[model samples]
Target: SGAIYVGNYRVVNRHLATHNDWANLVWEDSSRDLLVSSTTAQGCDTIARCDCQTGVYYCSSRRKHYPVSFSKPSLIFVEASEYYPARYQSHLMLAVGHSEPGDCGGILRCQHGVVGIVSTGGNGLVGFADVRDLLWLDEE
Candidate 1:
């Protein structure tokens, strides 16, 4: 597994559908990947500002590329957290599977793109907000 930290500009949670629905500025200066509306059409729900934080991490066995389609029961990769203890922490009722602590804030991304953010993990579940409805508002 590997990890890296990136800068986050800001985050906006419009609560357009569910409390989990929120958007964040990936960078002011970059996925260079466009947030596809395809993920939002089905329905949705879904960060932070100007400071480097865990952005991505991948297992050695991963393909290291986004997929064409994404859905539930899908296999997603999550990054490890900065703090060791925060890894195993859980929020709500979901948590990561066969993982350790400091896994929170870990990115949950599919082969095609990101689908969720690691909020908490437990019982073989990594709980994250649906990124389909994510919207980046100008107002900080």
Candidate 2:
């Protein structure tokens, strides 16, 4: 589901188009995906990341593949090209609550003040990481 991206669409009120790798996924919610630009470096990247930090825990990936290093949440939603093997790319996104104006910032703007889940570990690096055994797919 992560691999599937928003190929082309209509921008109602945004000067921007659409973007974000893990934006559209198979969460049963993002299926009716939507896009919203951000101005923050807070990149949670996964539901597992935010959900894990209920307390201090060691989350690592055993996959000897193109998995992004599962470390403390830092920077997220980078250009999918940044990753060596490349991940997903889609602006189609959804959430549990809160809404936005049109696809305003989906254009060539900045990625500051982004909405991401805060994680554990340190104060600066929040909202990131999965479990030790849990493995996601680079589904193409």
Candidate 3:
């Protein structure tokens, strides 16, 4: 069986290192951000944030369904300088519907840096990153 779905649960310490290691930890000047992504069995997908120091992962919504499965992932960068007050620290969620139209979805957050939403029926993926210290090279 796949991993048991424990909604809104803290990943075990060991698994934290396994999942949150080099893969999820987005490095910054003095702070580190953790990327948390998830999907439901029905195909709804979401991505959220986790505190690397505190080991607490925060999502937009509570786990509505149990035993969700997720796949297909990538990373993207956002310039912190441009989105000031909003900051480069942010989270993103993307969704698409397979069987129906008007099912596409997208939500982005920068203030608190967390996204909570359900995905559409088609394949979806979400990613998070830290660009606070990095200079916005393209903006000039």
Candidate 4:
């Protein structure tokens, strides 16, 4: 059972120092801004990770139908307090090691599909909010 295919949810992490902690999925608008997903419908594929050195949530898109070569992709990060529930209290979604293609300092592109619709660069991080977002194919 994934995230109902679309829903505004929070990650109920029970091991972030305390046995009780929670966090919400955040997305970046096209204007290059990060906002919490309190109303967006439809979730996506993205693997969320934490940098031991920084404690921020590293995020990125990891679709289900990509070729095997897509295994290793660049990743991005989000910042916030798992307990306070304040997203802006931290930082926006951002990508690092961006000396490569598609890397935007910290802004990862929530790329459009075969048709190319609407989405933001930093918005890609929302997909990684949970294991379900990865489409069960956690890669990047």
Top lDDT hit: 1
Q: What is the TM-score of each candidate against the true structure?
A: 0.32, 0.16, 0.18, 0.19
Give the per-residue lDDT of model 3 (tens digit) for 1-140: 01111233211111122443334332222112332223232222222333221112222333222122222222323233211222232332222222221211222223333232222222323222222222221121
Index of the highest-TM-score prediction: 1
Show the colliding residue pairs in model 4.
45-133, 46-128, 59-76, 94-106, 95-106
TM-score of 3: 0.18
Please list the C-alpha lDDT of all candidates, in the order they appear: 0.30, 0.22, 0.25, 0.24
RMSD of each: 13.9, 16.8, 16.5, 14.0
Write out the backbone clash pairs for model 3: 45-119, 60-116, 80-88, 96-120, 97-121
Model 4 earns a TM-score of 0.19
Candidate achieving higher lDDT, 3 or 4:
3
lDDT per residue for candidate 2 within 1-140, as digits (tens), equals: 01111212211111122344225322221211222233223433332213221232112221111111223323334222211122231222221212122212221101221122112222222222222112332111
Deviation in Å, model 3, residue 120 alpha carbon: 6.6
Candidate 1 segments exceeding 4 Å error = 1-96, 137-140
Winner on TM-score between 1 and 3 is 1
Shift of residue 108 alpha carbon in model 4, Å: 2.4
